[PDB]
């Protein structure tokens, strides 16, 4: 695919935000990643907002 493309991940489990800056999503939901970081939390966008989420709750939809 196109190089250095923004990562696309799919939620594998439901998640309820524990903090204001965290995302809430349901299994099956698609998130566009804005920040990949070690430590178990990534940042992404979903449904119009940007927030943090558990990286172990998602699986990247890999190219190509």
């Amino acid at each position: 695919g196109s190089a250095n493309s923004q990562l696309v991940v799919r939620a594998k489990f439901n998640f309820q935000q524990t903090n204001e800056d965290e995302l809430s999503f349901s299994k099956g939901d698609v998130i566009h990643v804005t920040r990949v970081e070690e430590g178990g939390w990534w940042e992404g966008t979903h449904n119009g907002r940007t927030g943090w989420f558990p990286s172990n709750y998602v699986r990247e939809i890999k190219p190509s």
Partner: peptide, 8 residues
């Protein structure tokens, strides 16, 4: 049993 998120 969903995975446990690490502390922030």
């Amino acid at each position: 049993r969903p995975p446990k998120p690490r502390p922030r």
